Amino acid sequence: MTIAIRQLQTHFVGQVSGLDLRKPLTPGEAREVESAMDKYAVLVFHDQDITDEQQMAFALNFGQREDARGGTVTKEKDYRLQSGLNDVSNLGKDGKPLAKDSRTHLFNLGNCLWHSDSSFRPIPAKFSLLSARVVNPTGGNTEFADMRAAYDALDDETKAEIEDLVCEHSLMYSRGSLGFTEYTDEEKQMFKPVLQRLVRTHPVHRRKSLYLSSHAGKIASMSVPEGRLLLRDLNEHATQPEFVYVHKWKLHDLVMWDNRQTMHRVRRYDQSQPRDMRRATVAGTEPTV
Amino acid sequence: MTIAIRQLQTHFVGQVSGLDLRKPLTPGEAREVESAMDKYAVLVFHDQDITDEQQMAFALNFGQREGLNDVSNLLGNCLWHSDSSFRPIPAKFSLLSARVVNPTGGNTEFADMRAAYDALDDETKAEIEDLVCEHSLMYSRGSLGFTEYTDEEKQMFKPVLQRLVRTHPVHRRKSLYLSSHAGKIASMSVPEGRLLLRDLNEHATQPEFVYVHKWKLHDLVMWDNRQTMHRVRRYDQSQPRDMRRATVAGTEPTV
Amino acid sequence: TIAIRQLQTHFVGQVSGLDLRKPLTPGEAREVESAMDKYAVLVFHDQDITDEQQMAFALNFGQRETHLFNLGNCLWHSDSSFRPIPAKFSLLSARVVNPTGGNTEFADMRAAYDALDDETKAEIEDLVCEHSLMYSRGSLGFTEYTDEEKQMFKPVLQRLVRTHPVHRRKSLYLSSHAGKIASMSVPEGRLLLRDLNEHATQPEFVYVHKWKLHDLVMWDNRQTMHRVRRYDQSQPRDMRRATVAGTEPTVQ
Amino acid sequence: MTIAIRQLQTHFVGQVSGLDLRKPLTPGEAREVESAMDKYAVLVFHDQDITDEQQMAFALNFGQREDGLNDVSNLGKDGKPLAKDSRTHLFNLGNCLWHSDSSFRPIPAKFSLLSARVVNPTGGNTEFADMRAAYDALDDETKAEIEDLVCEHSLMYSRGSLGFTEYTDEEKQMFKPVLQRLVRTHPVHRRKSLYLSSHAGKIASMSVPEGRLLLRDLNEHATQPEFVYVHKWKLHDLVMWDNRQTMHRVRRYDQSQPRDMRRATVAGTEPTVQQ
Amino acid sequence: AIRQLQTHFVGQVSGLDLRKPLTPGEAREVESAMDKYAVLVFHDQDITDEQQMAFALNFGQREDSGLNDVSNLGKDGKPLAKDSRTHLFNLGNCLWHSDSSFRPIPAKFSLLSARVVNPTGGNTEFADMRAAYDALDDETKAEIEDLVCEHSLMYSRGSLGFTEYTDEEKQMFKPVLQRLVRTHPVHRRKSLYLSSHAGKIASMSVPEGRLLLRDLNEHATQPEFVYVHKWKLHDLVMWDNRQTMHRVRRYDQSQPRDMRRATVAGTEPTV
Amino acid sequence: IAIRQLQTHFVGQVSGLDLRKPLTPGEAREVESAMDKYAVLVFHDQDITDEQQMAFALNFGQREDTHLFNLGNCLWHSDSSFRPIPAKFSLLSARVVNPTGGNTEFADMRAAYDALDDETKAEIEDLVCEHSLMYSRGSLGFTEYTDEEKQMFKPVLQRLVRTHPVHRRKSLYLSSHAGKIASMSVPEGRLLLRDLNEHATQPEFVYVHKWKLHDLVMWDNRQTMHRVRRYDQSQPRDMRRATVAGTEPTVQ
Amino acid sequence: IAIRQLQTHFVGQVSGLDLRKPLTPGEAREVESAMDKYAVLVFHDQDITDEQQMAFALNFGQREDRLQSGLNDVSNLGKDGKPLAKDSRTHLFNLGNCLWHSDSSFRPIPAKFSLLSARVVNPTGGNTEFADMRAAYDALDDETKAEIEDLVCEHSLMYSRGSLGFTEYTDEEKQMFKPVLQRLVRTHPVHRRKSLYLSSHAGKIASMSVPEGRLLLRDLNEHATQPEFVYVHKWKLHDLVMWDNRQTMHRVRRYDQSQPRDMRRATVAGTEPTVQQ
Numbered sequence A: 001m002t003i004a005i006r007q008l009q010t011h012f013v014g015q016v017s018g019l020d021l022r023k024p025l026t027p028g029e030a031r032e033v034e035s036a037m038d039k040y041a042v043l044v045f046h047d048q049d050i051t052d053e054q055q056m057a058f059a060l061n062f063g064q065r066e067d068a069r070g071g072t073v074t075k076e077k078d079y080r081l082q083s084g085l086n087d088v089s090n091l092g093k094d095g096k097p098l099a100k101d102s103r104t105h106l107f108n109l110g111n112c113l114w115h116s117d118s119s120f121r122p123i124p125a126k127f128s129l130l131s132a133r134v135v136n137p138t139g140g141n142t143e144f145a146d147m148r149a150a151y152d153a154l155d156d157e158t159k160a161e162i163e164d165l166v167c168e169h170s171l172m173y174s175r176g177s178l179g180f181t182e183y184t185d186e187e188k189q190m191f192k193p194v195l196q197r198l199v200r201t202h203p204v205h206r207r208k209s210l211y212l213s214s215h216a217g218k219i220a221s222m223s224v225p226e227g228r229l230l231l232r233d234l235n236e237h238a239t240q241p242e243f244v245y246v247h248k249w250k251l252h253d254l255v256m257w258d259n260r261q262t263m264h265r266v267r268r269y270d271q272s273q274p275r276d277m278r279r280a281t282v283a284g285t286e287p288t289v
Numbered sequence B: 001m002t003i004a005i006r007q008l009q010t011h012f013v014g015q016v017s018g019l020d021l022r023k024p025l026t027p028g029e030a031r032e033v034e035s036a037m038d039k040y041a042v043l044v045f046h047d048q049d050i051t052d053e054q055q056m057a058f059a060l061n062f063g064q065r066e067g068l069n070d071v072s073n074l075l076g077n078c079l080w081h082s083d084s085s086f087r088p089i090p091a092k093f094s095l096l097s098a099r100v101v102n103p104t105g106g107n108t109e110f111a112d113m114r115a116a117y118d119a120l121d122d123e124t125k126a127e128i129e130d131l132v133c134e135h136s137l138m139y140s141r142g143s144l145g146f147t148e149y150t151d152e153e154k155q156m157f158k159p160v161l162q163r164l165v166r167t168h169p170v171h172r173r174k175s176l177y178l179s180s181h182a183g184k185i186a187s188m189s190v191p192e193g194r195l196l197l198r199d200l201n202e203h204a205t206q207p208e209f210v211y212v213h214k215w216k217l218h219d220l221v222m223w224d225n226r227q228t229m230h231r232v233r234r235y236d237q238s239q240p241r242d243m244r245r246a247t248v249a250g251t252e253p254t255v
Numbered sequence C: 001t002i003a004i005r006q007l008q009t010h011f012v013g014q015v016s017g018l019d020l021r022k023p024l025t026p027g028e029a030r031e032v033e034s035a036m037d038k039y040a041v042l043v044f045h046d047q048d049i050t051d052e053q054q055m056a057f058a059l060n061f062g063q064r065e066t067h068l069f070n071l072g073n074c075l076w077h078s079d080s081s082f083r084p085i086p087a088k089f090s091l092l093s094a095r096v097v098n099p100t101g102g103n104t105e106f107a108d109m110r111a112a113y114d115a116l117d118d119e120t121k122a123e124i125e126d127l128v129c130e131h132s133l134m135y136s137r138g139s140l141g142f143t144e145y146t147d148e149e150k151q152m153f154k155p156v157l158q159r160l161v162r163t164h165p166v167h168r169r170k171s172l173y174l175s176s177h178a179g180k181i182a183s184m185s186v187p188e189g190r191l192l193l194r195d196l197n198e199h200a201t202q203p204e205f206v207y208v209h210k211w212k213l214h215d216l217v218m219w220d221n222r223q224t225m226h227r228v229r230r231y232d233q234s235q236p237r238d239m240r241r242a243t244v245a246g247t248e249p250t251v252q
Numbered sequence D: 001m002t003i004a005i006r007q008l009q010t011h012f013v014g015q016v017s018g019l020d021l022r023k024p025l026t027p028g029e030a031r032e033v034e035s036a037m038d039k040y041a042v043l044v045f046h047d048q049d050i051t052d053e054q055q056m057a058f059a060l061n062f063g064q065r066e067d068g069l070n071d072v073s074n075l076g077k078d079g080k081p082l083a084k085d086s087r088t089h090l091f092n093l094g095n096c097l098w099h100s101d102s103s104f105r106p107i108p109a110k111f112s113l114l115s116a117r118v119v120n121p122t123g124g125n126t127e128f129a130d131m132r133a134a135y136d137a138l139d140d141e142t143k144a145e146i147e148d149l150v151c152e153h154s155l156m157y158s159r160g161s162l163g164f165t166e167y168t169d170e171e172k173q174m175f176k177p178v179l180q181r182l183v184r185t186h187p188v189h190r191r192k193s194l195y196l197s198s199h200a201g202k203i204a205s206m207s208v209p210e211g212r213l214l215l216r217d218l219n220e221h222a223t224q225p226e227f228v229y230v231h232k233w234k235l236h237d238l239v240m241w242d243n244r245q246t247m248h249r250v251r252r253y254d255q256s257q258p259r260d261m262r263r264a265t266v267a268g269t270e271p272t273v274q275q
Numbered sequence E: 001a002i003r004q005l006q007t008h009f010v011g012q013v014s015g016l017d018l019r020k021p022l023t024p025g026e027a028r029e030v031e032s033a034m035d036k037y038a039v040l041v042f043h044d045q046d047i048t049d050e051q052q053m054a055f056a057l058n059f060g061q062r063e064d065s066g067l068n069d070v071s072n073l074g075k076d077g078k079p080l081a082k083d084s085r086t087h088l089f090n091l092g093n094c095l096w097h098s099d100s101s102f103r104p105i106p107a108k109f110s111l112l113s114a115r116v117v118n119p120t121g122g123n124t125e126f127a128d129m130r131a132a133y134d135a136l137d138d139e140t141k142a143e144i145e146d147l148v149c150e151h152s153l154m155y156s157r158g159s160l161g162f163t164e165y166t167d168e169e170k171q172m173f174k175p176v177l178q179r180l181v182r183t184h185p186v187h188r189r190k191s192l193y194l195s196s197h198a199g200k201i202a203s204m205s206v207p208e209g210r211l212l213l214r215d216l217n218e219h220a221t222q223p224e225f226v227y228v229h230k231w232k233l234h235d236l237v238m239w240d241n242r243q244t245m246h247r248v249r250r251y252d253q254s255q256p257r258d259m260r261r262a263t264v265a266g267t268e269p270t271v
Numbered sequence F: 001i002a003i004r005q006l007q008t009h010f011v012g013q014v015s016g017l018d019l020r021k022p023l024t025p026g027e028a029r030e031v032e033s034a035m036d037k038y039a040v041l042v043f044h045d046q047d048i049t050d051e052q053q054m055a056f057a058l059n060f061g062q063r064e065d066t067h068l069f070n071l072g073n074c075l076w077h078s079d080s081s082f083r084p085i086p087a088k089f090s091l092l093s094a095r096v097v098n099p100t101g102g103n104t105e106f107a108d109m110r111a112a113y114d115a116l117d118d119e120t121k122a123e124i125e126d127l128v129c130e131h132s133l134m135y136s137r138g139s140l141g142f143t144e145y146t147d148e149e150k151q152m153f154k155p156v157l158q159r160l161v162r163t164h165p166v167h168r169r170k171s172l173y174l175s176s177h178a179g180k181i182a183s184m185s186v187p188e189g190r191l192l193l194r195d196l197n198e199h200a201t202q203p204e205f206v207y208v209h210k211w212k213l214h215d216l217v218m219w220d221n222r223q224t225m226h227r228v229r230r231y232d233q234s235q236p237r238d239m240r241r242a243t244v245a246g247t248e249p250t251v252q
Numbered sequence G: 001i002a003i004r005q006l007q008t009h010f011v012g013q014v015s016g017l018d019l020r021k022p023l024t025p026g027e028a029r030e031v032e033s034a035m036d037k038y039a040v041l042v043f044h045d046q047d048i049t050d051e052q053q054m055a056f057a058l059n060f061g062q063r064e065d066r067l068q069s070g071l072n073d074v075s076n077l078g079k080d081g082k083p084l085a086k087d088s089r090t091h092l093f094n095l096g097n098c099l100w101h102s103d104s105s106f107r108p109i110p111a112k113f114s115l116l117s118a119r120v121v122n123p124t125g126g127n128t129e130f131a132d133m134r135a136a137y138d139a140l141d142d143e144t145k146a147e148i149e150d151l152v153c154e155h156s157l158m159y160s161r162g163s164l165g166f167t168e169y170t171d172e173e174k175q176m177f178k179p180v181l182q183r184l185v186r187t188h189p190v191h192r193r194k195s196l197y198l199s200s201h202a203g204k205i206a207s208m209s210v211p212e213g214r215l216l217l218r219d220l221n222e223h224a225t226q227p228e229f230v231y232v233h234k235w236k237l238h239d240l241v242m243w244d245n246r247q248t249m250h251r252v253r254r255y256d257q258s259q260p261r262d263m264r265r266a267t268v269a270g271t272e273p274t275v276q277q
């Protein structure tokens, strides 16, 4: 009836055991994992030595593939992986680490900022599923923040202030804060800003949460300076240690998160060493606006 | 009339009593205040009903002018910064007087850059020792959405160099020279540099290095820009907030 | 699974086996309230809760009832004793704890009463006190009040000796808000109250609470006094209060 | 969104919009709902898809649990409809009489809150009667006559009406009659109202037959259509009532069909009479 | 001459001296009027007990002078004590009922004469059980058609607090069966056979059966089915127990109320 | 002169003196040194006159220049602290002893000072209190003063920490007459005085004197506080005072 | 403490005490004096635990040498908490309480106070009656008083049980139930009133033949249990009745054994013997 789950942080995060992700799930098991995703927001599976196909098959229990187009500087040519998965590694087509100053790596440094995946899309992602294929031993922890806990801890005046606010999300905002400011020219059209609610409501349990993300570069109804200051304050509030779970990677871990309830980021790592990390993304169902 | 100092935070900040800033300082008083600034980096004076000229006269004990700077609301200041870090010779002391206090928000927060430096692991210390940052108003304003400037403006705000690790002239303690004005590290790519600056700013502004100052009427707070960062928290723009700053010019560069 | 450890000779229970993030069962609500009747003060460690969760916990026990408030809390008092229907339970949740000072102290007014001699007990049995914010603020140095403030803070009557509605133990109804005994001259009455307060807050009747992050302390204003000890106002402190309205008066 | 109230009947009953009962209330919202209960005596909320915990949590704004929802459904422990000759169902049928909740308790109930979880489509309307308006409409002579009268309330009396008249000694003590004023006064707005209830089987200072006949006349008077609001249930309705100002009853329903209704009861905060 | 006093029933009768014996045709007209109007009001009838009964006996036999004492007076022509055994049984008449419905063959006509009028209350109310039956919806009529009620004095007195009965009293007051819906033998109109004496429906549990009866009583005693009669001295009111219910309202027990009833026995059972 | 110590920190009982007789210079010298050391001196069986009591007092300096006074004495105080030059010694002679209550208690302000932590010593060092009869009578409930009285009872300044002119020991200058600290806000200063008073009058710093007929007790106001405990006011209590005027101010 | 006398000669109803709480020195002294005067005390609505009941009893002395406490189980229930079999060993022995007796009169130092608490009331029968042995003594004539003054009875459980049929005892039982001596006429240590020491356990007068002694005890018991000397207690839930075994007899009237009767007794050990032995 229930799968084995141990909670890893005071507010959220469950560790799951007893499931082999190389193999199909039963209807009951898929139902259990999704309820755990609703409750815990982040799930940690150890020792899941899976193929790209096995990983995506697992993800497809929970919806459909998110269309990857408009998500990277993909050159419209080709890259490393053959399957459905998003390549979130530090490797080129080469199979070995990207150059310190390449346009691909510099864009990938965006992942070091606190973000919710595909928040730059009119329908943002539901679940993201990350598999560790080669572990970089010098840094690159992945950190998760509970946006519902963060929301709850705000005072009434803040909650009343932010309730109806709308943010503009774009890859140009997140990469822009890192100094990556030149886009040509269908990129400016491909990364055209989308609207998202600052405060969102989960469809299952109806918990309210802060929809924070590096992609959010302004609040619609405010001046750019004031809006950004507010977002900075909310981001500082929401990423305090009491709302954060730090994941230390082991080989063949799978960590999956609900983008609708969380932010995440990768910490600085040594770029000269391989880091083979591969993501499956489940498309969102409904927009926030 | 005996100067008494009580330490307000684990690592820094001193509360000073027995001085009347309306009255000129004696040689011993000037020496003690500057010595406390060396030690505590931030000093808090309560109950100082002082004019603009008294504030400056107090300030001028410690050097020259960079009368007062208007930091009243009558927004870059909300970012963690060190004053005039975008100048080739950056500011020494800043002295802030509260003439009208905003009752809703507007705390001034102070971060100890020396304690922050010390808490770093020896590898990080070694990584950063010789690193140099570019500081400009264009960078700090840029964070708040001001990213385009004319050729006349580009020269007035032309970036200057400062070392990431500075050393205090008096006690020789090392400290992180962080500021919102710092937009890149000279020997690193813009994104890699800004990420390191982010990590250092995050580390250096944890609660264990931070003193939060809650304002009272006629409060004077003074700080060493060479040893600290500071920021003002969001305040109700509708209500008058009258804060007046005296600034002591720097007496040496960092590079 | 509720377990209570007694913390002081006369009173105070440390409660384990409850997660206050979750709604109480009717049985748990009954157990908690009976423990409040018995111990008068309950300490709950490790309760990392929200304002809403705190209030929800409180509302099992009844209904809902800055600088001047904080300062007055440094004097021995019982909450809202200046109201004709005074407070039942108060609840304090430690969100940010000041490391220097700010212990909260509690005194068992039932034990204080019991320790009085037979003649003192007979002397004070029918006495009535006048309670007002003007008296407690007076002690802090604010003696002058405008004509509309005088109505705003019009003194209320309270029995000096009250009886608990559940176990019917008598206790001394002492409070910084009490500034007069009705049947006595002003100075004699205040001297009697001063001696009663000194008696009632001897270390044998006092529990000292040294705060830990996420503590929740709930106390019965009908059986106790409390005070906060001196602390450095320049340090961060974040203590969140909930108060349950009184369900009965002491006089008319 | 803030609270709006719409009048549903000449003298009483309000329909409330703008409140989500899945969410904890602010102090202001608790105040507004209570004042509205004082004025309207019965409040109707539509579209409140709530859990038991959420229902109780809403209820606890207004006091304490009466000595954990009360199961006023027609269902057994297995979740299926009770048999029509089962002792549980025969007691539940007591709600079909005009009553005020816990009037057999020395300190009787304040608020009752009833949530429709599964609606029976064949009957089972809940009717409410305004005991204040009913009192006011009496002539001066009747008001003077009844002013100081006291009733005896017990489960033995309401269940007696329905055929259960023989009680063991344990039961006679467990259901020992309590005293209640016949004319009560609301603690907030001071309006007088008839404290009528099926649990009332006697007036203290009168013969049992003369008392019951007087009670029958007051009940007939107080439950004329002019003082009565008829509630037709929709799924996830919540109707809450002040037992201190009203009577209520459930109309006959089809016992073969499920009727899942769940009550939260706030304990009384003051007696009507000493004992 | 008959003047109709209410929407569905009740006739006021003029030009008849109840002191004088009735002709064959007058006995027929009065009875046909009772068939139609269910209740008849006679004004100014200063009649003796023997004269009252003589009028009654035109319509059948006495139910086992021969008049029923429905007064508030004791054996000495004086108002009864408020707490006395007889008065507390008289109070049974304050409940809506049909006369002798607890007898296996229930009463036909009842004839009440006003000898001394209590001026403080004590109106007699009548309810038309035919109009009441008619106003019910089709689904209800279907439900109630074949139902059978248990009638006993133990039930009506039970309501007023007399629940404890001896083995000997339990035989004297043994419940009788009566149809819930009865058909008048003359005009064939269906009517609700409601009564305070009815305490059970045969095929149902006591509580559910009693709840059904309450709903029926509530429906049937709405003001639209009820005629209120205010008493004048030497009034006589007669009713068909087979088509009606009646009750007396609260009266001042300190003041005399001398009312005398003549009961014609039933000529048919309902079961 | 033989001296017996009566409390852990202070108080000496003196035998070998007959106060009906003039003191020799040596006797006067030994008594004053004993006053410096013990702060309070107890002399049993001195059946003396007013004139003899004053003559005895006058060895130690000069004379200092109602119901309310007796009531004020129930509060912890140092005599004449509301005067710009406050009392040196006070002397109390027991002519008629009330059997019910009326113990006189003494608190050692030097021992009280010593036992404070370094932070508090640093905090208080240069603080200055305002002392006035309006403050002490305030605590008894008399808060309203005409401008005539406000001049008569004009507050005077005293050091919170004073130093004894002979042995140089620091001590807490506490008194019921002190109602404000000059450099602090009114409530915060009063709260600080309250904490210091509570600290200084703990049992470890207190000598309780139980009166015996013809006792004389002399105390140094510069080193102590004192108070009288409650007694039955309808019984006679004849306690005669002599006061030696101060010989040095604390500030200005 | 308020006391209302409930019978001509004795019995007091007590108001003002909550027996869930410790007594003060004054409260304990008042209760004991009330016991000296009224011999039987009735308390209503005392919803107490075993520990609380015993704590109340311990005010007046020490304990006498299903429940798991100091209390004597005088219920009709077995270990399982259900009514005993009507033919069982324990029940037939408990029926002993239906005879007029004074508690522990078969011990060399007999009981002081007994305190009985009603936890589950039997609805059919089970009244507890009490007889005033002092009033009974007073009403005897001068000659009878003179005759009995120095008589001594033998008390044993073998005698009380013998009268209900159990006449056969082994050597072991005969030693466990070895008869003890008690004065027939006893004196109260406080007010010095003489009273008849009657009991179902008394089966012999020492100086007389068994038949003549038993006939004399019968005459005294008949005299002493006349309605004028007897108070009848009808039980209510959480009643507590306390009696002085030194001045009274008591008995329980027959009760419906198929229904639970949960009655719990605390017994205070005697503080003085009646004979030196």
Ligand SMILES: O=C(O)CNC(=O)C(=O)O
Binding pocket: A088, A111, A117, A128, A130, A140, A141, A142, A264, A265, A266, A277, A279
């Ligand atoms: O590589 C990492 O640890 C960070 N991952 C992501 O941001 C991602 O896959 O969405």
Ligand SMILES: O=C(O)CNC(=O)C(=O)O
Binding pocket: B071, B077, B083, B094, B096, B106, B107, B108, B230, B231, B232, B243, B245
């Ligand atoms: O106004 C404030 O509190 C912030 N002040 C400054 O940043 C400043 O004057 O340099």
Ligand SMILES: O=C(O)CNC(=O)C(=O)O
Binding pocket: C073, C079, C090, C092, C104, C226, C227, C228, C239, C241
């Ligand atoms: O500890 C505190 O903050 C003071 N406590 C109180 O008096 C209170 O909150 O009611």
Ligand SMILES: O=C(O)CNC(=O)C(=O)O
Binding pocket: D072, D095, D101, D112, D114, D124, D125, D126, D248, D249, D250, D261, D263
């Ligand atoms: O079931 C119904 O409609 C009526 N319910 C009640 O009487 C109740 O819950 O108190």
Ligand SMILES: O=C(O)CNC(=O)C(=O)O
Binding pocket: E070, E093, E099, E110, E112, E122, E123, E124, E246, E247, E248, E259, E261
């Ligand atoms: O006395 C009355 O008016 C009531 N009449 C009857 O019920 C009757 O006599 O049948």
Ligand SMILES: O=C(O)CNC(=O)C(=O)O
Binding pocket: F073, F079, F090, F092, F102, F103, F104, F226, F227, F228, F229, F239, F241
């Ligand atoms: O009377 C007493 O016990 C003490 N009196 C004094 O305070 C005094 O005379 O100075």
Ligand SMILES: O=C(O)CNC(=O)C(=O)O
Binding pocket: G074, G097, G103, G114, G116, G126, G127, G128, G250, G251, G252, G263, G265
């Ligand atoms: O059970 C009873 O009523 C009487 N009981 C006793 O004899 C007893 O407990 O001593």
Ligand SMILES: [K+]
Binding pocket: B082, B083, B084
């Ligand atoms: K600046």
Ligand SMILES: [K+]
Binding pocket: C077, C078, C079, C080, C081
């Ligand atoms: K308060």
Ligand SMILES: [K+]
Binding pocket: D099, D100, D101, D102, D103
């Ligand atoms: K009920």
Ligand SMILES: [K+]
Binding pocket: E098, E099, E100, E101
């Ligand atoms: K009849």
Ligand SMILES: [K+]
Binding pocket: F078, F079, F080, F081
């Ligand atoms: K003085």
Ligand SMILES: [K+]
Binding pocket: G101, G102, G103, G104, G105
């Ligand atoms: K025995």
Ligand SMILES: [Mn+2]
Binding pocket: A111, A115, A116, A117, A264
């Ligand atoms: Mn990501």
Ligand SMILES: [Mn+2]
Binding pocket: B077, B081, B082, B083, B230
């Ligand atoms: Mn600045």
Ligand SMILES: [Mn+2]
Binding pocket: C073, C077, C078, C079, C226
């Ligand atoms: Mn408080």
